[PDB]
């Protein structure tokens, strides 16, 4: 089975990246873990969050049959592709808190879920009070648009079930909707997912 | 012996991870240093511990005789596969404090014990106090299921031998319990070792 | 699809301008925030997008030989990039963004770090109505003007994603096209200043 | 289309394991003061933001600009040639290199390399907040290698203060990097630079 | 002159570089020193001391000997101390990663002998209560390799006193005394004894 496995590894590995006329579909999701800090001398908040990607692509295909059953894999992320996923609004390099391991399934299917702490842009001005702060932060490719990568959602909330209940700041609500915005640079759109969040002191 | 030790890591040399059909156990356990700081304006606690992991693989054995009797030998742990045990409540990346040096035996077996600084998700509330604060950070695989890498300890307790005398806190009771869930969704079954301290100033 | 754009990847795959074959670089700045002023030490940060253009013939195709590829999308370690650096950083610049450039068919590369800067400034009045000033040059750090002509499209710095619950406020942001020159030498050494106005 | 293959093929003709006892080497320094950034009374600790101007020549570096179409030098990065270990003795963390790492290579084989770099040095700012000011030095010299094998030298006894932050928290009273040899049969050169500075 | 010594180096470095480490039958003795420049901070509320100090390292392989005669009697080199092996001598209370403040570049001679003097910061475990009194604070630190035992890597010192005549004479802190000495330990890991040299320093304001 050992030997299979790298066999199979091997073949797959002896992808360009998506174009207009091969583009790839970018599922998105974020379950956010912790609200660890508010700043409101900078305006920075700091979000440890897990992002759920996934993407399927012809190239990792493969026969189960051929290869003694084996239906997916655990891969270091530097043996693929993956997309350039980039908060628009933070103002510190996002830092990765997870290994950087891909699961590949004999469909072609890769997940991917990093687990990253992120400094970005936010007033918490009201978190102290009922009604709390509002905030967003918009994901979306840095250099790919619409006609290269498609970002999709499988639902419009954000999974709440892992947040730390002993936080210091509780979740009033945490929602992941599409958009699609048009940069100065480009003439072409882009697609984001925006994840808007209403917090206040617990 | 030198030539001889240099021979066996070339032929070592020239592991895809666990399979269903092909799985690991790493045995886990902690040695916990220092809690370095309570944060309750962040609720994040910073622990300093040392990380043993052993595990033993086929492809690592040799027979002695063949080598100049070298029983084991020391090297980096990028020249290995090491397995993905990750804490699931760090706010921040964990720190290394001592070399990635692995120690592999002729039996396959591998020991590596990295020495790291960790801030993790820990409200401290009651730290001044008689009873102390509580809390818990649970470690595993990122990306393999029970089915893959299996998690043994050999022991539920922390070791406090070496824990600062002089730290800033004391430790009351630090616990490594190992957790087989089975969550009602799926068959595979997700083990976890989990680090409970309990602390006071 | 994916073969053709494999395939002009690795037929395309620059040693540097030189005052023979000097390359015009266009830089624009799009200001997202200003996340802090520190009176104590007169540092204040910034976040921004530094868009890059410049165009090269070795990076030219027809995009009828390649399926009507016209463009793509490249890791910036593959290609050449400028060396443009903030002249009064106080700290390393830290970057946001992937390091990923696009190249086009004519052979010109787009390229937009986004980066935190901590640089040289003295808030001081940025608590009153008139605001504080402060100002920070990007050039090149090694090539003078005749081997990177740096150039800008526009004076007015990009606003339009600055960040509205900012603790700062920007009341004027312009990016003006400045070289200094000796005398005894014909070299002039070009660079864009950053002059932003702001207040609390 | 010329220029660029000529450069090219320069560079592939030229592409040094550092100075000895029988081939030393001169490395000229010089400091430009850019701006103290902060002054840390409670550890002792002055933070300098400064470009460090390193100079030294190599046989093994020229060429005849005829024989590559007159050109007369060129730039690359400085990992692809040997730098002299110039550091600073006083440091209390890691130098941090703002600027790109790229030298310029001229054809009569000198190298120039100007890193900008911001210093935490040890350095006691008592005085600071008076008329008098703060005195604070810090001495820069080759790691492992002695005078006779780098042969370290400057253009002037004066940092260059021409950058100085005109809005700095602290101004400059003076700013020198004299030279020093100190004997323990090797002579170790040093470029030590002294700062007074008041808020 | 100059020429044939150049040339000399380079044939003498490509040679030499063209080891795994020590083992039972062939260990190395390693000699450690330790040279305190600078108490940097104390932080009563977290218990971690900041110390600046250059660790002096010395060990001699057979695989870097060669004879002068045979490259224009060139006696000794630097060279990266990436290019060589180096030992992973390690402290072992630290509470942040060591960091590195002077180049790794190392000396070595004809001999076989390897120097290495890195330049560090340290944090590490230290409670500074009483440092603002007579008597001062005490701290120790232990330094060893962190993988080989006594029998791969014999730990020596030159002396038992912690070189203080660079130590920075308006440091916050003054140094009352300063020891490294050597001690074999058992850890609960491994069978074998592992050595180490600790720094004792006793400081106050
Ligand atoms: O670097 C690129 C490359 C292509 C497009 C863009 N940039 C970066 C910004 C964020 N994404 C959209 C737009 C502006
Ligand atoms: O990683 C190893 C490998 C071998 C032995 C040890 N460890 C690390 C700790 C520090 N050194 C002694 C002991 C415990």
Known sequence: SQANLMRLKSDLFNYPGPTKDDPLTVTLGFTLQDIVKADSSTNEVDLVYWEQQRWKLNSLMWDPNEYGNITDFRTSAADIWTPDITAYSSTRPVQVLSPQ???????????????????????????????????????????????????????????LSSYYASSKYEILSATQYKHDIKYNCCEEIYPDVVLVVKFRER
């Open 101 to 159: 391991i891909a699961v590949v399934t004999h469909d072609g299917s890769v997940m991917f879920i990093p687990a990253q702490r992120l400094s970005f842009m936010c007033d918490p001005t009201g978190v102290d009070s009922e009604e709390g702060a509002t905030c967003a932060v918009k994901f979306g490719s840095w250099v790919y648009s619409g006609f290269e990568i498609d970002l999709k959602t499988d639902t419009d909330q954000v999974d």
